[PDB]
C-alpha cells in the first residue's frame with residue numbers, strides 16, 4: 351500500500367491517546383485513518399499487536415524529538431535560551447504532538463503508559479544533569495511539565511522570554 | 524449516608540476514569556454501589572448528573588484553595604509555606620486523585636476546563652498581590668509540573684527542593 355499499515359499505526363496512536371488503551375477498536379482506527387476496516391483487520395487482526403505498534407510509534411517519536419533537543423543543546427552553547435526556544439517550538443507544534451501529550455497526561459494515573467512517558471523525564475535528565483547538576487535538571491523538567499499542562503489548561507503559553515527567565519533562575523548558581 | 528451524594532461522588536469517579544462521554548447510569552450504579560441504575564434514574568433522570576459531579580469537584584477545589592489562602596495569611600515565609608502545602612498535596616494523592624485526573628484530562632477536554640481553571644486563576648489571584656504577575660504565574664506553572672512529574676516519575680520533589688525552586692522563582 352506504500353504505507354496503509356503505517357497509516358493504521360498512526361491512527362491507532364491518536365485513537366489510544368483519545369480513548370485510552372482499552373478503547374482500541376478496528377472501526378475507530380479506520381475512521382481515524384480514513385481507511386477500510388478490512389485493511390485494519392488484515393494487517394492487525396490482534397489488537398494487542400496494534401497496541402504495541404501504536405505505543406512503539408509514539409515511543410519512537412518521543413525519543414526522536416529528544417535526540418533533536420540533544421543535537422541543538424550541544425551546538426547552541428547557551429542553555430537557558432536554547433531550552434526556552436525548544437520548549438516554545440514544542441508548545442506551538444500542537445499538530446502531531448497532541449498524542450504524545452494526550453498519552454503523557456493519561457500516564458499520570460495509568461502505569462501501562464509510563465514506560466512511554468518516563469522517556470521524557472529520564473531523557474531530559476540525562477541531557478541536562480551533566481551540564482547543570484541533577485537538582486537543577488529535575489527542577490527544570492518539572493517546570494517544563496508544568497509549562498505544557500498549564501498552557502493547555504489556561505489556553506495561553508509562557509513566552510520565550512518568560513521561559514528563559516524562569517529557566518535561568520532555576521539553573522543559576 | 525445520603526444516596527444522592529454517593530451517586531454524584533461516584534459519577535465524579537467515573538468521569539475521572541472514562542471521561543465525560545463515558546458517563547452512564549450503569550457505570551455509576553456500579554461505582555456508586557447503588558442496587559440498580561434505578562436509584563440512579565430516580566435521583567438523576569437525565570445527565571444533569573454531570574453538572575452535579577462537576578460542581579461537587581468545583582466545591583472541593585475551591586475549598587482546598589480557601590485552605591491554602593488561610594494558611595498563607597497565617598504565616599510569613601511564603602516559599603516554605605507553599606512547599607509544605609504542596610508536599611501535603613502530593614502526600615494526599617488518595618484523597619485528591621479524582622480532582623487530579625480531571626485536571627490532567629482537562630488538558631484535552633475543553634468541557635473540563637472551567638472546573639480546571641479554578642486552580643491557576645485561583646493561585647494566580649492569591650499570589651499576584653504578594654509577588655506580582657511574573658512570579659505568581661511561574662509558581663503556578665511549576666506547581667502544575669510538580670504534581671504531574673511526581674506522578675509520572677513516581678518520585679515527588681521534597682519540601683526542601685520545592686522551597687528552593689520556589690525561592691528562585693519568587694525573588695524579584
Ligand SMILES: CC[n+]1c(-c2ccccc2)c2cc(N)ccc2c2ccc(N)cc21
Pocket residue numbers: 411412413415416436437440450451454455469470493494495496497498499671
Ligand atoms: C510528551 C512529553 N514531553 C513534554 C510534556 C508534555 C505534556 C506534559 C508534560 C510534559 C514536553 C513538555 C514541554 N513543556 C517541553 C518539551 C516536552 C517534551 C519534549 C520531548 C519529548 N520526547 C517529550 C516531551
Ligand SMILES: CC[n+]1c(-c2ccccc2)c2cc(N)ccc2c2ccc(N)cc21
Pocket residue numbers: 499583584585587588608609612622623626627641642666667668669670671
Ligand atoms: C487539581 C489542580 N491542583 C493541582 C494540580 C493537580 C494536577 C496537575 C496539576 C496541578 C495542584 C498541584 C500542586 N503541585 C499543588 C496544589 C494543587 C492544587 C491545589 C488546589 C486545587 N483546588 C487544585 C490543585
